């Protein structure tokens, strides 16, 4: 529904979609070879399967040939800075694939909005048209060098060259935090065994310890205990409370 979606949004208004309460098969995403670039920063591409993530956001837009390398943390560019900025500590995978089959039929649909947003904080959308604002003292017309329309659009023709050839890109934004994990991978789980030296991974915490019943009473909302040294010591069993 978001990755193999019928329609992709423009860079002008890139759609942000909530994903929750769903077990996620990352294997079909990794094994499938339709994906051109699959370079990952916060997570291993191969090990994207086992781990659990609290919240996954999927970002959708369509880019040229240059942006596949341009859309990365710490890289500077026209669209990279003026349109959609990737946080320097972004934890996730950038995913891109071919778009000749679906797009570039003349297909004039896409728009990218250049000079207007000189500075944008990360993950921010600018839906204001703002026709002028390039900079000069006069206004109310474009005039010359004084101002110009930021909202330029892509022209995709059935004759588009490989260099300007369009590509579809989907960026899944993983926010790594401690909270109830909506998405996890397709692994069934064993029951509980106590008072035994067992390698344990609870809600994806991981570690080695001895599982024992705790007399300490959580407040109902709390999920993970911790120590003076800020290491995990108390956990709430996910399936049964």
């Amino acid at each position, epitope marked *: 529904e978001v990755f193999n979606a019928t329609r992709f949004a423009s860079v002008y208004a890139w759609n942000r979609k909530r994903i929750s309460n769903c077990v996620a098969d990352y294997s079909v995403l990794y094994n499938s070879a339709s994906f051109s670039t699959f370079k990952c920063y916060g997570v291993s591409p191969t090990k994207l399967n086992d781990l659990c993530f609290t919240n996954v956001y999927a970002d959708s837009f369509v880019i040229r040939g240059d942006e596949v390398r341009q859309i990365a943390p710490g890289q500077t560019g026209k669209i990279a800075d003026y349109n959609y900025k990737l946080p320097d500590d972004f934890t996730g995978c950038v995913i891109a694939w071919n778009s000749n089959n679906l797009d570039s039929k003349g297909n004039y649909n896409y728009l990218y909005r250049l000079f207007r947003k000189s500075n944008l904080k990360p993950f921010e959308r600018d839906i204001s*048209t703002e026709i002028y604002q390039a900079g000069s003292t006069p206004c109310n017309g474009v005039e*010359g060098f*004084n101002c110009y*329309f930021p909202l*330029q659009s892509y022209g995709f023709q059935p004759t588009n060259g490989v260099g300007y050839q369009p590509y579809r890109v989907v960026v899944l934004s993983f926010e790594l935090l401690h909270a109830p994990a909506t998405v996890c991978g397709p692994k069934k789980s064993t029951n509980l065994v106590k008072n035994k030296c067992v390698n344990f991974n609870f809600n994806g915490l991981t570690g080695t310890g001895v599982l024992t019943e705790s007399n300490k009473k959580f407040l109902p909302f709390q999920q993970f205990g911790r120590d003076i040294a800020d290491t995990t010591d108390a956990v709430r069993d996910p399936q049964t409370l």
Partner: antibody
Amino acid sequence: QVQLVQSGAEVKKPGSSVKVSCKASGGTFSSYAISWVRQAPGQGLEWMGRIISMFGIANNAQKFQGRLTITADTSTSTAYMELSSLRSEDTAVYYCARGPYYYDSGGYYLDYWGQGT
Amino acid sequence: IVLTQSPGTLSLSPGERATLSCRASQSVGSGYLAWYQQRPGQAPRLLIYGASSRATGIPDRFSGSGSGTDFTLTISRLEPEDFAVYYCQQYAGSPRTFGQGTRLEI
């Protein structure tokens, strides 16, 4: 190829409101800055409005500011104009204008006009 | 701004080199003018845009020049079917203003 249909000639009573159409047939619509112009009989042409089709937002010429509401219906690929406070002298021929609003491609103003009302 | 043309009408026999210049009261730009040719009782048609960037679909015979506050449109070889009305049209910013028109008579 591209054309805007001519209407039947109009005469209007003072104080009413007149709606004038502008059809677009053929070519690649929704990428043009369709606008609105007019010329009184025996006087030069004067501009009234400018429409960017994608965001459907329009601006009105100073001299006509506060009297014209202009909208563009992308679904039917048409451009509409609404004029209020009609007077006796306002009966005249009314034109329609367009042209791509794209910069760094030169352009900004082009022709692609029709015939009139 | 008012775009003052030169002159209101130039009475030229066919074949004459007609410079229908147009002068601006303040600077506008060198890729900032456009000229439209209105056929009798019809709607004007673009021939030259951005002062000198020739519009596609138009013969080379028509050629605009100038920059700043003084702009020039030249018609090199008048033919009998070219009698028509020509309008200059400021292209930079502000409300669009169209020239007063030149009528070519016999």
